[PDB]
Design a protein around this ligand. Structure first.
Ligand SMILES: [K+]
Ligand SMILES: [K+]
Ligand SMILES: [Mg+2]
Length: 1337
RNA sequence: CGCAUAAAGAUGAGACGCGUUUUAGAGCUAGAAAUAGCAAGUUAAAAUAAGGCUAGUCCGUUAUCAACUUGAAAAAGUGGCACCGAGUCGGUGCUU
DNA sequence: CGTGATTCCAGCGTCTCATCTTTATGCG
DNA sequence: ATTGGAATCACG
């Protein structure tokens, strides 16, 4: 019956827990030990931590799943093509497709001739001589007119269909037009022929280079406008240019059309949009648009083709043949030049696959860039290589046809080549003539993103509904698949249900019912005052309806002045109006009402009550579907009500956005007695004018009970389901679930007595590629040449100062100057918001400057003068996305007011008050689980108070009272943080019950700038003996009550004693490994049993395969095996290591599995399943965690005494020095007086390593390295001993560096010993254990 | 408390481009062979987690997971306390 | 000739679309 | 980045 509290520290890979009592002491208990060993009891402290691998997101699984679907559907494309061809192919060659299928198999496994295409050596050689690449064949079939072998036609069509290109361009691309300059001049011609007053003159402008520039589209537009004399990017010609290049231009202001009429060429809606714009102005400008379309084509077609198109209808295949021919010519030239000038390197270039020369480029793993890096010095160190070098710097030297950059080829080009082949060969082959659209559809068919997987009820990811029960081929897809239903289910399966009625789906945000609801909700709060009024009074239902009919239904926004004049003055005849409860501009407005009024031009239809469900369906359809065709399909039912043009205008309108209130919630549920819905009450409440909340918070009204009935239905969810529904990372969700489980186990351990308080705190927690892409886009948009000055590696951009330099165009952000790339370690990285106000260290808040003093004052936002200097530069960076909206607002906050003392107070408070929503959700879960009893009046009984702390409170407590944390010693700090949290948190609610509303979970009613500033600055000052000097009492009092919240004479002793306890329950969560079967790399054939066949029949020794399988869990099996020629049965105990691929086969029948592996007469009761991280104790406390069936991890924690931890913190100058010069001097002197600690610390590590780690060579290496550097400053030795602690850590062995020396991993690559050790099964807290003596088996 | 914007993250769908693996693309000459010299090289088929049954243009890498007992499962149930101490927890007393 | 030390190695780039939450910053 | 799988190397 002893009161206690729980403190928790939740992280992504750790959950620290601690149980404390009223005196801040951690209890200890004797726990029963189950199993077959002699040990029966163990004393353990109720402080510990759970360690687990981070929870992964589903994104990688999603990408693998989508890739699997794409491979299945590509094989289906080829299958459809072969089905079309099969009847005629069986005549031409019956075994052709069989050879294609078996082409992977080796000679002895092939059932037909080893040559796939023609089945004889002569014809195969002749084919490969005539068409060196498939593109030769494609060009021949597109251009030639004599009948081709059916096998060749199939091969070309299959190549086009299999690798078809992207669908990022909608409509048609005609490759007949490729000249940029000619089409640009034609556009200018049409513009001048239609516009004579201000003609466009652009002669003498390199249209080809500017428009096809490698820079960004926006910068290309800027460059073209720059060379356009007397033109504007927002002008009509500028809009045409933006449309052509790809940027979406607004054509409203060009013609003053009063509608946006945005025209994006790539989008399919453009056509319809274009027609709309033709209705806005006329057909005279249509020619310009036509030219713009053609111009756009050339812009995107000159990028990939770069070949003449008047002589061929296969510009892509001809471009690839040009690649082939230039590669051949350059290869011959390079061979000759190398054999003439550097004859010794030829073998390196053209024979050595390991090297990145031509042989490595073709036969080895060298990419194009690696080959260019290898060959550029050789080209430079030779004569006659000017053309080769020019090609190389243009990235056009010795190219391959199948390259990384073929991702810019639209499927329209492949479709054009396929269509040309079909037209050429259709007369010779009738089935090609009558299956032409079939094959074109095979190439171009693509399941819409809103239909998803074409499942038949066996997929958890599928939502499509089928009109008819038939197989969905690409040809009957539009007939078998219900696309409207599929798209609606696509949107609605991801959208929310309203919380009040969890089975009901939310309304569209722009629903007329929702707008009416919000308008009435705000209007019921309108408190008008006019002359002759004794007291302020609310408006009545009739007045509200009159105002809605007058103000809202005729004005988009309704203000106070319009309310006073057009209603109170015009009708009420009251010239003195003062409003209360609202602002000048009403937030709620009938935007949907006015938009529908403009679209349909009818008022009776809108105001009619009985047809409003039609409007609800209208807005729902306009919200659900973005495609004009589907909107048309759904609205066709309402075509009779409106006109055809009105139907088109409706089709154009789209209402993005959903709400949070369902239809039933607003106007579906009715009160038992009144029979009025919530909307009805909002319309006519009476004198009360209650809002929606008061309407659902009234006990007399049945709405509260109806909501409760809806909420109870479904009984919430299981803990795992409720946690998964949270908005957070899967890693933090794993942390939260483990936190709840440890709390349940701790409550069990404490005799089912629930804690008095649960104080919880959560941590706030490739990249180089993201930085590279961001800087590339920013520089391209800006138009700078900085990146061309210096090619920076991705890992080199990981430097903070370098990244800031590159993001700022190399220029100081506060003044107008330039920084030097080589003057690093000299400039200053400053924070836009000072670290005192906000502890933010991300790039979004950091600025690189030559000297920080240029910012102005260091106690506020940077000065107004700096803003006036660099606002244009900041805006240019923001438009290039080198700085964000947040960064720009922070930088320019001075001109908008700067930082008032109120903002400083708020930032000070938020450094201690945890406002994160995820922490509130965790607190709610814990409170709901702990507090369940209800009052007689149906009110929660807060038996357990859930407090939420921030990491700053505990961190500052650690720093102030020398409770220093070094994260490298061991994992105990996790546990320690949890303890400290409770120790702080409970203390706070002892000292400040009035502050519960900021810390304890629950809506407590307990609630100038300098006052709050100093209050929260010194809110934790009751712990320290001497303030500022002020000497608060030794024993702090509760305040207005008599309790000992803190006893400075003995409570600090208790905290220091707790942090020095050697036994802390650190548990690594044992997990069965799931995921990929093995390494994905397909290795070449070799005679090794570690190769895994990629198919049943693909024997690895002849076809290669996978290796490195991941072990799901090991299996301790005691059985017999055959030994010797006589195959005598030897008894063996062994770890098998069931891999992920073998797991299902093993669990289906373990005995059959083990007999297949070779073990005989296994004991199914003696088989032990051992997941990863299974704990074993061997001797002297040496603990090994099973990492796999053949590898062990360290499983021991080093309990370094607290004095060494504090000395290493001070000596390392953790986070530099943040103390007063007097205290810093005292601590530095303490370090100097305590140099000998270093030796002692080393001894600690050494003795620990001699008992547990057992890495003899690494320990000797470490000792020698330490002896080498004994003359270094104490600080550097301290930092490097912090590094040294990696030798003794728990978990996987790692490599560490002591100064210069690097000590590599000593790995325990043998699990033989653990077969005769003590396996330990630990509960989540580790308090409950079962020890199995495996040597007894 | 309500709107607008931006960023980040989560989830799902539809698609591209490569990469890899085996086979095909008769390598030739001098050679007894070792090999040497020369020539050639750019392409394609197929697989792209083994595979499964539910046979779909589906599904197969997320989440969840100590032990023991009751179980389809979800899951439920199983382990005295106090005190003195502390090198990973030990001991003493009370109790059962 | 086993066995500990050592070395090496690991699928990756892009685009379109939708929904949700959370945080930051204005406005109100 | 990490950390287990695999091959290879050095050597008593
Ligand atoms: K797992
Ligand atoms: K466990
Ligand atoms: Mg497959």
């Amino acid at each position: 019956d002893k009161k206690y509290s729980i403190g928790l520290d939740i992280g992504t890979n750790s959950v620290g827990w601690a149980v404390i009592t009223d005196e801040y002491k951690v209890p200890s208990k004797k726990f029963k030990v189950l199993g077959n060993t002699d040990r029966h009891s163990i004393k353990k402290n109720l402080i510990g931590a759970l360690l687990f691998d981070s929870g992964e997101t589903a994104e990688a699984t999603r990408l693998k799943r989508t890739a699997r679907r794409r491979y299945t559907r590509r094989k289906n494309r080829i299958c459809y093509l072969q089905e079309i061809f099969s009847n005629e192919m069986a005549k031409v060659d019956d075994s052709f497709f069989h050879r294609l299928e078996e082409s992977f198999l080796v000679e002895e496994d092939k059932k037909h001739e080893r040559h796939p295409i023609f089945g004889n050596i002569v014809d195969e050689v002749a084919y490969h001589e005539k068409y060196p690449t498939i593109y030769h064949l494609r060009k021949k079939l597109v251009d030639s007119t004599d009948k081709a072998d059916l096998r060749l036609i199939y091969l070309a069509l299959a190549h086009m269909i299999k690798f078809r290109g992207h669908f990022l361009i909608e409509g048609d691309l005609n490759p007949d037009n490729s000249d940029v300059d000619k089409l640009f001049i034609q556009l200018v011609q049409t513009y001048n022929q239609l516009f004579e007053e201000n003609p466009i003159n652009a002669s003498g402008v390199d249209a080809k280079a500017i428009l096809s520039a490698r820079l960004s589209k926006s910068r290309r537009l800027e460059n073209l406008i720059a060379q356009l004399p007397g033109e504007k990017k927002n002008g009509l010609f500028g809009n045409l240019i933006a449309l052509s290049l790809g940027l979406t231009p607004n054509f409203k202001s060009n013609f003053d059309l009063a509608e946006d009429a945005k025209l994006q060429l790539s989008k399919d809606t453009y056509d319809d949009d274009l027609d709309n714009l033709l209705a806005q102005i006329g057909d005279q400008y249509a020619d310009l648009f036509l030219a713009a379309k053609n111009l756009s084509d050339a812009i995107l077609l000159s990028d990939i083709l770069r070949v003449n198109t008047e002589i061929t209808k296969a510009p892509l295949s001809a471009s690839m043949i040009k690649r082939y021919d230039e590669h051949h010519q350059d290869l011959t030239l390079l061979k000759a030049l190398v054999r003439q000038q550097l004859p010794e390197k030829y073998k390196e270039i053209f024979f050595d696959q390991s090297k990145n020369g031509y042989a490595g480029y073709i036969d080895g793993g060298a990419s194009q860039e690696e080959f260019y890096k290898f060959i550029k010095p050789i080209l430079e160190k030779m004569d006659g290589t000017e053309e080769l070098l020019v090609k190389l710097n243009r990235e056009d030297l010795l190219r391959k046809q199948r390259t990384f950059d073929n991702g810019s080829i639209p499927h329209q080009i492949h479709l054009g080549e396929l269509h040309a082949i079909l037209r050429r060969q259709e007369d010779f082959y009738p089935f090609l003539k009558d299956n032409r659209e079939k094959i074109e559809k095979i190439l171009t068919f693509r399941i819409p993103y809103y239909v998803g997987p074409l499942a038949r009820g066996n997929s958890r990811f599928a939502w499509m509904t089928r009109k008819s029960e038939e197989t969905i081929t690409p040809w009957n897809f539009e007939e078998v698949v219900d696309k409207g239903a599929s798209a609606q289910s696509f949107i609605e399966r991801m959208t929310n249900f309203d919380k009040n009625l969890p089975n009901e789906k939310v309304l569209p945000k722009h629903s007329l019912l929702y707008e009416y609801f919000t308008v009435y909700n705000e209007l019921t709060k309108v408190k008008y005052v006019t002359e002759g009024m004794r007291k302020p009074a609310f408006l009545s239902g009739e007045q509200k309806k009159a105002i809605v009919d007058l103000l809202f239904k005729t004005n988009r926004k309704v203000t106070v002045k319009q309310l006073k004049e057009d209603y109170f003055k015009k009708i009420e005849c009251f010239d003195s109006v003062e409003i209360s409860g609202v602002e000048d501009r009403f937030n709620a407005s009938l935007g949907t009402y006015h938009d529908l009024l403009k679209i349909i031009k009818d008022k009776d239809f809108l105001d009619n009550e009985e047809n409003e469900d039609i409007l609800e369906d209208i807005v729902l359809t306009l919200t659900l579907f973005e495609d004009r065709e589907m909107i048309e399909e759904r609205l066709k039912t309402y075509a009779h009500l409106f006109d055809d043009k009105v139907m088109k205008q409706l089709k154009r309108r789209r209402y993005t956005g959903w709400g949070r209130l369902s239809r039933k919630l607003i106007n579906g549920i009715r009160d038992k007695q009144s029979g009025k819905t919530i909307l009805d009450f909002l319309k006519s409440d009476g004198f009360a004018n209650r809002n929606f909340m008061q309407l659902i918070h009234d006990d007399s009204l049945t709405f509260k009970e109806d909501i409760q009935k809806a909420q109870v239905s479904g009984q919430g969810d299981s803990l795992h389901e409720h946690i998964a529904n949270l908005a957070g990372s899967p890693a933090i969700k794993k942390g939260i679930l483990q936190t709840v489980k440890v709390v349940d186990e701790l409550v069990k351990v404490m005799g089912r007595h629930k804690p008095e308080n649960i104080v919880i705190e959560m941590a706030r927690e490739k990249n180089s590629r993201e930085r590279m892409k961001r800087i590339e886009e920013g520089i391209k948009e800006l138009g700078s040449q900085i990146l061309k000055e210096h090619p920076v590696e991705n890992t080199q951009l990981q430097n903070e100062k370098l990244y800031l330099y590159y993001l700022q165009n190399g220029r100081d952000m506060y003044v107008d100057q330039e920084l030097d790339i080589n003057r690093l370690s000299d400039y200053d990285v400053d924070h836009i918001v000072p670290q005192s106000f906000l502890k933010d260290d991300s790039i979004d808040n950091k600025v690189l400057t030559r000297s920080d003093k240029n910012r102005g004052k260091s106690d506020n936002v940077p000065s107004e003068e700096v803003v006036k200097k660099m606002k244009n530069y900041w805006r240019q960076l923001l438009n290039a996305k080198l700085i964000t909206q947040r960064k720009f607002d922070n930088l320019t906050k001075a001109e908008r007011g700067g930082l008032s003392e109120l903002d400083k107070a708020g930032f000070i408070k938020r450094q201690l008050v945890e406002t994160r929503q995820i922490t509130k959700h965790v607190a709610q879960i814990l409170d709901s689980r702990m507090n369940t009893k209800y009052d007689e009046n149906d009110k929660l009984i807060r038996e357990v108070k859930v407090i939420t702390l921030k990491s700053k409170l505990v961190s500052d407590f650690r720093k102030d009272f020398q409770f220093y944390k070094v994260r490298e010693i061991n994992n105990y700090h996790h546990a320690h943080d949890a303890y400290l949290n409770a120790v702080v948190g409970t203390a706070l609610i002892k000292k400040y019950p009035k502050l519960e509303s900021e810390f304890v979970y629950g809506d407590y009613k307990v609630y100038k700038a300098t006052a709050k500033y100093f209050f929260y600055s010194n809110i934790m000052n009751f712990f320290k003996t001497e303030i500022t000097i002020r000497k608060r009492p030794l024993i702090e009092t509760n305040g207005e009550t008599g309790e000992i919240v803190w006893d400075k004479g003995r409570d600090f002793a208790t905290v220091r004693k707790v942090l020095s306890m050697p036994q802390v329950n650190i548990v690594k969560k044992t997990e069965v490994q799931t995921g990929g079967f093995s390494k994905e790399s397909i290795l070449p054939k070799r005679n090794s049993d570690k190769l895994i066949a990629r198919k049943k029949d693909w024997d690895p020794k002849k076809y290669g395969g996978f290796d490195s399988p991941t072990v799901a869990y090991s299996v301790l099996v005691v059985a017999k095996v055959e030994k010797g020629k006589s195959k005598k049965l030897k008894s063996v105990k062994e770890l098998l290591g069931i891999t992920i691929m073998e797991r299902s086969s093993f669990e289906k029948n373990p005995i059959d599995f083990l007999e297949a592996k070779g073990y005989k007469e296994v004991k199914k009761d003696l088989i032990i399943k051992l997941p990863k991280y299974s704990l074993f104790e061997l001797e002297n406390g040496r603990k090994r965690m099973l990492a796999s069936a053949g590898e062990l991890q360290k499983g021991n924690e080093l309990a370094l005494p607290s004095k060494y931890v504090n000395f290493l913190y001070l000596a390392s100058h953790y986070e530099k020095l943040k103390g007063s010069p007097e205290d810093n001097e005292q601590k530095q002197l303490f370090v100097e007086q305590h140099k000998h600690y270093l030796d002692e610390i080393i001894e600690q590590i050494s003795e620990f390593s001699k008992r547990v780690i057992l890495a003899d060579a690494n320990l000797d290496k470490v000792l020698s390295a330490y002896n080498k550097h004994r003359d270094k400053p104490i600080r550097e030795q301290a930092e490097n001993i912090i590094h040294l602690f990696t030798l003794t850590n728990l978990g996987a062995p790692a490599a560490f560096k002591y100064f210069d020396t690097t000590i590599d991993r000593k790995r325990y690559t043998s699990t033989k010993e653990v077969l005769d050790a003590t396996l330990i099964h630990q509960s989540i807290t580790g308090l409950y254990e079962t020890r199995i003596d495996l040597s007894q088996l």
